[PDB]
């Protein structure tokens, strides 16, 4: 019995999300995760969706100036909650997401949550600050007929469940 069991039974089971993880608000790094897939399938790699140790990317600005940036993925989650913007976007598992929206103290059936949403090609993610100094990360994949709104409700339901514990 672990966080995996809990994430799987309470959230992955909804079929509304392609993956879900929990990160500490201390560093924004995912410490537990689950993903849709046929474990095992020798070859599913849930962690590649949720984690990548620091890496440099090359960036070119509109002046054609090329620089190199070190991405710390955890910091890109924290910056959105801490500052209300993402200077470099939100990066998770080596994938860049566009920061689309944040709501603070969004009310969901008697419980209030800070919720951020980010988008990528045919999918996206939600970040929800949840009890016990944690951040929930939920992924959705529009190729799977999951959607932005339904995945958010799934995440919110799970968060409420946590709050209720």
């Amino acid at each position: 019995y672990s966080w995996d069991s809990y994430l799987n039974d309470r959230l992955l089971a909804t079929n509304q999300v392609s993956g879900a993880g929990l990160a500490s608000e201390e560093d924004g790094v995912v410490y537990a995760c689950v993903a849709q897939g046929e474990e095992s399938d020798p070859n599913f790699d849930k962690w590649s969706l949720f984690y990548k140790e620091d890496y440099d990317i090359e960036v070119e600005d509109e002046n054609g100036t090329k620089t190199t940036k070190t991405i710390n993925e955890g910091q890109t989650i924290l910056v959105v909650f801490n500052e209300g913007y993402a200077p470099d976007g939100v990066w998770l598992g080596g994938t860049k997401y566009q920061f689309i929206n944040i709501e603070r103290d969004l009310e969901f059936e008697g419980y209030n949550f800070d919720v951020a949403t980010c988008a990528k090609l045919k999918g996206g993610l939600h970040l929800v600050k949840v009890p016990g100094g944690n951040i929930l990360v939920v992924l959705y994949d529009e190729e799977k007929e999951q959607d932005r709104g339904n995945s958010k409700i799934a995440a919110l339901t799970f968060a409420k469940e946590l709050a209720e514990s």
Binding site: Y1, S2, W3, S5, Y6, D9, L22, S24, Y31, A32, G132, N134, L162, S165
Partner: peptide, 8 residues
């Protein structure tokens, strides 16, 4: 250290 999962 991660927290313990909630009871089922």
């Amino acid at each position: 250290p991660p927290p313990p999962p909630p009871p089922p």
